[PDB]
Design a protein around this motif. Structure first.
Motif, PDB file in Angstrom:
ATOM      1  N   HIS B 204       0.868  -1.206   0.000  1.00 50.72           N
ATOM      2  CA  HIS B 204       0.000   0.000   0.000  1.00 50.72           C
ATOM      3  C   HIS B 204       0.895   1.243   0.000  1.00 50.72           C
ATOM      4  N   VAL B 205       2.039   1.180   0.693  1.00 53.64           N
ATOM      5  CA  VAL B 205       3.073   2.263   0.741  1.00 53.64           C
ATOM      6  C   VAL B 205       3.666   2.439  -0.670  1.00 53.64           C
ATOM      7  N   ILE B 206       4.098   1.348  -1.314  1.00 55.05           N
ATOM      8  CA  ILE B 206       4.666   1.344  -2.698  1.00 55.05           C
ATOM      9  C   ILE B 206       3.601   1.862  -3.668  1.00 55.05           C
ATOM     10  N   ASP B 207       2.341   1.494  -3.433  1.00 53.63           N
ATOM     11  CA  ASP B 207       1.199   1.811  -4.328  1.00 53.63           C
ATOM     12  C   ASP B 207       0.860   3.309  -4.242  1.00 53.63           C
ATOM     13  N   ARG B 208       1.167   3.981  -3.127  1.00 52.92           N
ATOM     14  CA  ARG B 208       0.957   5.450  -2.996  1.00 52.92           C
ATOM     15  C   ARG B 208       1.688   6.210  -4.112  1.00 52.92           C
ATOM     16  N   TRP B 209       2.786   5.656  -4.653  1.00 55.48           N
ATOM     17  CA  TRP B 209       3.703   6.311  -5.631  1.00 55.48           C
ATOM     18  C   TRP B 209       3.263   6.046  -7.077  1.00 55.48           C
ATOM     19  N   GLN B 499      -5.947   2.845 -10.462  1.00 53.84           N
ATOM     20  CA  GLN B 499      -7.395   2.530 -10.357  1.00 53.84           C
ATOM     21  C   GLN B 499      -7.711   2.376  -8.868  1.00 53.84           C
ATOM     22  N   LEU B 500      -8.598   3.216  -8.342  1.00 53.93           N
ATOM     23  CA  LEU B 500      -8.897   3.311  -6.894  1.00 53.93           C
ATOM     24  C   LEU B 500     -10.095   2.434  -6.530  1.00 53.93           C
ATOM     25  N   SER B 501     -10.825   1.941  -7.526  1.00 51.48           N
ATOM     26  CA  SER B 501     -12.028   1.092  -7.334  1.00 51.48           C
ATOM     27  C   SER B 501     -12.303   0.355  -8.641  1.00 51.48           C
ATOM     28  N   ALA B 502     -13.038  -0.752  -8.600  1.00 50.96           N
ATOM     29  CA  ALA B 502     -13.377  -1.539  -9.808  1.00 50.96           C
ATOM     30  C   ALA B 502     -14.410  -0.762 -10.626  1.00 50.96           C
ATOM     31  N   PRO B 503     -14.262  -0.726 -11.975  1.00 53.73           N
ATOM     32  CA  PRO B 503     -15.216  -0.034 -12.833  1.00 53.73           C
ATOM     33  C   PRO B 503     -16.630  -0.518 -12.521  1.00 53.73           C
ATOM     34  N   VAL B 530     -13.226   2.608  -1.779  1.00 51.27           N
ATOM     35  CA  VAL B 530     -11.768   2.895  -1.893  1.00 51.27           C
ATOM     36  C   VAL B 530     -11.084   2.344  -0.639  1.00 51.27           C
ATOM     37  N   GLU B 531     -10.114   1.440  -0.822  1.00 49.31           N
ATOM     38  CA  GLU B 531      -9.456   0.682   0.275  1.00 49.31           C
ATOM     39  C   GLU B 531      -7.982   1.097   0.397  1.00 49.31           C
ATOM     40  N   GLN B 584     -13.044   5.210   2.951  1.00 51.39           N
ATOM     41  CA  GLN B 584     -14.013   6.221   2.464  1.00 51.39           C
ATOM     42  C   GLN B 584     -14.551   5.766   1.107  1.00 51.39           C
ATOM     43  N   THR B 585     -15.710   6.304   0.743  1.00 55.19           N
ATOM     44  CA  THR B 585     -16.404   6.047  -0.537  1.00 55.19           C
ATOM     45  C   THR B 585     -16.307   7.308  -1.399  1.00 55.19           C
ATOM     46  N   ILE B 586     -15.849   7.160  -2.649  1.00 53.81           N
ATOM     47  CA  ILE B 586     -15.966   8.181  -3.736  1.00 53.81           C
ATOM     48  C   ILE B 586     -17.354   8.036  -4.362  1.00 53.81           C
TER      49      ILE B 586
END
Ligand SMILES: C[C@H]1CC[C@H](c2ccccc2)N(C(=O)C(=O)Nc2cncc(C(N)=O)c2)C1
Ligand SMILES: CSC[C@H]1O[C@@H](n2cnc3c(N)ncnc32)[C@H](O)[C@@H]1O
Ligand SMILES: [Cl-]
Ligand SMILES: [Cl-]
Lengths: 302, 625
Positions: B204-209, B499-503, B530-531, B584-586
């Motif tokens: 999740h740390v690597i994914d922030r970038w 991609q922050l959520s599934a289409p 969003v996880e 949180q939810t978008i």
């Protein structure tokens, strides 16, 4: 000789060791010189022995009487052996073990081991005999400013860093390092001097020109003074029976202090940064400072 | 293979040192422009008046070498966010000095560390320098994957390392960048040089970038394991990261001394080289689009505009799409004309938007594959294309094909159709107005007639990319709204995004649409779980379509028709990026809108915060009917 004098260390017998760096111009190298005439320095022509290093010198210390331990920009720690006649200075070993400027060295009470402090944040314990790293300690979070061996114990030494931590070490514990110093996070430590006749107490200088007296045992900041206007780059105790403290600074001033850190002498003879200071083992009222103004001043201390 | 440089903090002779690294195999050198240890005074006498020179001469290299081979480094003593007033003021002047000297040499980049949380003054000074006349120089902010404080050996007996999950804490390094980046107002000359430590942190740390402008990945020699022979190598988890960074085409820097003292420095390098040559080589899609990565283009409007020859040419260079179209027609013929009726039932078959007639050929190939009779019309409003049809029709198709040169909404057809075959789909399905076109063309379909396709559906997914958010920001044009560029969609091969959520599906349309109250306007609300912690920069749009029954096309990455390169995804940006905290939810809202003349999308974010409604009344973007 290079313009920027970094290190100045008197031997047992009264000979003057000079480390110096090129910090500007085409070549950014360094050099080590010995001056059996201490009054003859900085002059290359009247020197007992000198040599060119691959690269500059950040800190320097004697390894007994013929031994010179060097903290190289290159990330190497260098041991230079004096000649059998003391005319030459020959590279004993040069081991590339740090990943960034080696910024500080200190020889341990024995003198077959030493500790380096690099800008790569690591501190290492060295076997000068075997020429390898025994321990590699990443205790800090920032570049390591200063490491200083215990006068009398091999397993014990201080270190300080831009991470604001002063660490008391003891290689006998399974967690060697231990975080001491004043109540709140003061300004950054810059320079460490052990007390010569109380292996329980030390003094650290900060980047804000304050020198502070600390009791490890009592781990409480007994006393401090605003000595310099700028960063305190080095601290040396006099060999005297009841010793004087010499404080170097980037304000281009030497101050000498008693045991309650009151001001006794003050010298603005330097017109660039004051880098080092050693006390004359022959006359305990003579003190030899070097600077980045290429000057080698000899002070008379009342 | 890899564009890779060397990081040194020691340069005795610049001529030799550069000579060395070039023979070792490096493409450039990162080095200090003043001696790292040579602190300088600017206010207080005497040190103020220190005789020069203050560094080595610019004459030591060719302008060519300076411009191409030398990345500058800020001296590590320069600390503009010191707690000491004197060290702040001094470092301010010292920092301008080092940067202005980098500029004077015309250096392609200059390195600056983020290694504490408060770099406010550092940003101010850089930002000040940047707005001193428009120069090309890049700034590489050196940031660690893991903050040194959270990497340190657990050896302080009275300050131990917390062994407790710190999710947000373990990301703090990214927040350093985010703040600095934000303070400097998303400058395009400020990129990331990402420093990788011994131990990688949580994904999740690597994914922030992801979505971040990474120009460099710094590898200390430390982090290299040693194999049997003696060569340096990297963990399997380090190898995964290298593959992620290679697809971002980052420049790899190697910092620190040789810890594999048997092998040369070309060893460390030659591993990176071995890694890049030994990766899954580029598939059909990846090899076609290798140029278009994060390239914003305006969406084609084949209705309102007439497509150029070479546009149609690439639509036609897609064998999988026309395989699928050929089949879709094949299956419909059989289902409509019983075997016994083969020679007595000819099917009336009407391509709507025939372009240069690849659908017309598909319609023939599909008729002699299914052994049925078909009569072909080719309706095409683009007269330039209609030139290409009539030349086909005369040379090859003969009277079978009856080229019609008009709008399918206008054309009064002689007979009705069994099958209407269209291709009017955009990256967002309905964004080329296939709905409005096949509606005006419904009256000349037989009461039992098929459309190919019969169904399409749009898909949206929220994304993070401070990279693409900067590309859109860059699209401000004179003589229009200064923010107009955010209120319009872009066709773009998304890449360096997250991609922050599934289409989820947005808008669906059926053809024929027998519905008595035909309305093609739409209001869809979507809720995106969003996880991760991240920053919203817009919504990726894709589509799926049912040609006939179980023959379908998709650019929806999950169900993506394999090896089909006619459509890239669409991007709906938003004006102000939105912070989204894990869990949180978008919530996004989309409207398809229209009057007599225009079709357009309006869109809004309603959670976790409300955005401004984008493109109200089509002010910034419309689609011509
Ligand atoms: C693959 C790239 C080059 C073509 C085109 C483009 C080129 C210039 C600017 C904007 C987009 N493009 C698309 O994604 C697209 O719009 N495709 C499309 C649209 N409509 C119909 C069909 C079709 N049936 O083939 C395809 C990106
Ligand atoms: C192959 S991409 C879409 C094609 O459909 C055509 N087209 C779009 N709208 C219409 C319309 N209303 N009538 C006929 N052809 C159309 C365009 O000219 C283009 O060649
Ligand atoms: Cl620059
Ligand atoms: Cl992110």
């Amino acid at each position: 000789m290079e313009r920027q004098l970094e290190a100045a260390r008197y031997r047992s017998d009264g000979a003057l060791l000079l480390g110096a760096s090129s910090l500007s111009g085409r070549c950014w190298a360094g050099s080590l010189w010995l001056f059996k005439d201490p009054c003859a320095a900085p002059n290359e022509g009247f020197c007992s022995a000198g040599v060119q290093t691959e690269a500059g010198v950040a800190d320097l210390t004697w390894v007994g009487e013929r031994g010179i331990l060097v903290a190289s920009d290159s990330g190497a720690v260098e041991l230079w052996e004096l000649d059998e006649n003391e005319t030459l200075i020959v590279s004993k070993f040069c081991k590339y073990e740090h990943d960034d400027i080696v910024s500080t060295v200190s020889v341990l009470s024995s003198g077959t081991q030493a500790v380096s402090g690099s800008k790569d944040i690591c501190i290492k314990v060295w076997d000068l005999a075997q020429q390898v790293v025994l321990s590699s300690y990443r205790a800090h979070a920032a570049q390591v400013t200063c490491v200083a061996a215990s006068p009398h114990k091999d397993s014990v030494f201080l270190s300080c860093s831009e991470d604001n931590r002063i660490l008391l070490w003891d290689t006998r514990c399974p967690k060697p390092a231990s975080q001491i110093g004043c109540s709140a996070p003061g300004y950054l430590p810059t320079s460490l001097a052990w007390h010569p006749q109380q292996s329980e107490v030390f003094v650290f200088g900060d980047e804000n020109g304050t020198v502070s007296l600390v009791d490890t045992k009592s781990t409480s900041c007994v006393l401090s003074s605003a000595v310099h206007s700028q960063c305190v780059t080095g601290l040396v105790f006099s060999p005297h029976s009841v010793p004087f403290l010499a404080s170097l600074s980037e304000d281009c001033s030497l101050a000498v202090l008693d045991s309650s850190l009151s001001e006794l002498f003050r010298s603005q003879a330097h017109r660039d940064f004051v880098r080092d200071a050693t006390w004359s083992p022959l006359n305990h009222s003579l003190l030899t400072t070097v600077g980045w103004d290429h000057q080698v001043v000899h002070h008379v201390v009342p | 293979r890899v564009s890779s440089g060397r990081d040194l903090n020691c340069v005795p002779e610049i001529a030799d040192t550069l000579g060395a690294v070039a023979k070792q195999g490096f493409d450039f050198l990162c080095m200090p422009v003043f001696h790292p240890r040579f602190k300088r005074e600017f206010i207080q006498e005497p040190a103020k008046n220190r005789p020069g020179p203050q560094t080595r001469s610019d004459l030591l290299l060719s302008g060519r070498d300076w411009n191409t081979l030398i990345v500058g480094k800020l001296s590590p003593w320069i600390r503009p966010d010191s707690k000491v007033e004197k060290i702040r003021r001094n470092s301010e002047a010292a920092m301008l000095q080092e940067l202005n000297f980098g500029a004077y040499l015309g250096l392609p980049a200059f390195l600056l560390p983020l290694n504490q949380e408060d770099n406010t003054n550092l940003a101010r000074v850089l930002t000040n320098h940047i707005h001193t006349g428009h120069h090309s120089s890049m700034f590489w902010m050196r940031v660690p994957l893991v903050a040194p404080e959270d990497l340190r050996d657990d050896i302080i007996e009275n300050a131990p390392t917390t062994h407790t999950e710190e999710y947000s804490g373990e990301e703090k390094t990214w927040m350093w960048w985010h703040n600095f980046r934000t303070l400097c107002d998303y400058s395009k000359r400020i990129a990331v040089a990402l420093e990788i430590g011994a131990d990688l942190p949580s994904n999740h740390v690597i994914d922030r970038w992801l979505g971040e402008p990474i120009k460099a990945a710094i590898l200390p020699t430390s982090i290299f394991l040693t194999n049997k022979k003696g060569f340096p190598v990297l963990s399997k988890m380090h190898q995964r990261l290298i593959f992620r960074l290679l697809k971002l085409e980052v420049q790899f820097i190697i910092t620190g001394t040789n810890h594999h003292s048997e092998k040369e420095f070309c060893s460390y390098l030659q591993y990176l080289e071995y890694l890049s040559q030994n990766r899954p080589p580029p598939n059909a899609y990846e090899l076609f689009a290798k140029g278009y990565e994060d390239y914003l283009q305006s969406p084609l409007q084949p209705l309102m505009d007439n497509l150029e020859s070479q546009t149609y040419e690439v639509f036609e260079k897609d064998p999988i799409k026309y395989s699928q179209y050929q089949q879709a027609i094949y299956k419909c013929l059989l289902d409509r004309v019983p075997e016994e009726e083969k020679d007595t039932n000819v099917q009336v078959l009407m391509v709507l938007g025939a372009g240069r007639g690849p659908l017309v050929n598909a319609s023939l190939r599909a008729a002699k594959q299914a052994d049925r009779r078909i009569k072909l019309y080719a309706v095409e409003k683009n007269p330039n294309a209609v030139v290409t049809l009539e030349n086909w029709q005369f040379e090859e198709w003969g009277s079978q094909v009856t080229v019609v040169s008009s709008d399918m909404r206008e054309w009064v057809a002689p007979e009705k159709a069994d099958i209407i075959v269209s291709e009017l789909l955009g990256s967002f399905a309905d964004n080329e107005l296939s709905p409005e076109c096949l509606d005006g063309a419904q009256h000349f379909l037989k009461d039992d007639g098929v459309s190919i396709p019969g169904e399409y559906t749009s898909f949206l997914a929220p994304i993070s990319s401070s990279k693409l958010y900067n590309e859109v920001r860059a699209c401000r044009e004179k003589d229009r709204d200064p923010e107009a560029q955010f209120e319009m969609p872009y066709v773009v091969r998304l890449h360096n995004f997250h991609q922050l959520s599934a289409p989820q599906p947005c808008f669906t349309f059926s053809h024929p649409n027998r519905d008595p109250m035909i309305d093609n306007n739409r209001y869809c609300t979507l809720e995106f779980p969003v996880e991760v912690n991240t920053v919203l920069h817009g919504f990726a749009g894709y589509f799926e379509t049912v040609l006939y029954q179980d023959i379908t096309l998709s650019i929806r990455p999950e169900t993506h028709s394999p090896g089909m390169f006619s459509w890239f995804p669409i991007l709906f940006p938003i004006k102000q990026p939105i912070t989204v905290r894990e869990g949180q939810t978008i919530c996004v809202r989309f409207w398809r809108c229209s009057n007599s003349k225009k079709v357009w999308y309006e869109w809004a974010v309603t959670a976790p915060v409300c955005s401004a409604i984008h493109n109200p009344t089509g002010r910034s973007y419309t689609i011509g009917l």
